[PDB]
Structure 1
Amino acid sequence: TYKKPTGGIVTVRSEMGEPIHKIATRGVMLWKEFDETIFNLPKNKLVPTLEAKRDYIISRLNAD
């Protein structure tokens, strides 16, 4: 559950970086994806990354 959906459940970090077993819905899969790509980045890299990915982020947020 720390790597991929396993029995339909996945692990995702909370805002304090503590693990959470959740049913791997589209919403939770986006959450897991943004943990791997956006929320793990250092503070100096976050704002540039968001601006760059903006239109992707927004389509996923609205869809999922």
Structure 2
Amino acid sequence: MGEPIHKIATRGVMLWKEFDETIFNLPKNKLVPTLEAKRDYIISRLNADFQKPWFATVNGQARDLATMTYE
């Protein structure tokens, strides 16, 4: 909801702040294109520095839910 929260400056929290300052603030019409553009960067940061990694990551290789198998 955009309320301030003090948090320890963990790598995940710094990613949270960066996304707050570069992705989340943007308007709704502008959020989808920027997510598409920075998909690779966002996935890399989620996998490296955030508690919720990108799901479609198989043995470290960033992938997609449509590009990964059932196993």
* TM over 0.5, shorter chain: yes
Structure 2 unmatched runs, 5+: 50-71
Identical residues among aligned pairs (%)? 100
Task: Name whichever structure is richer in strand by fraction.
Answer: 1
Equivalenced residues, count: 49
TM-score normalised by the chain length of structure 2: 0.68
Residue of structure 1 aligned with 2:29, choices 34, 40, 44 = 44
> What is the RMSD computed on CA atoms of the aligned residues?
0.3
Structure 1 unmatched runs, 5+: 1-15
What CA distance in whole angstroms lies between the structure 2 residues aligned with 1:43 and 1:21? 26
> Cα offset for 1:22?
0.3
TM-score normalised by the chain length of structure 1: 0.76
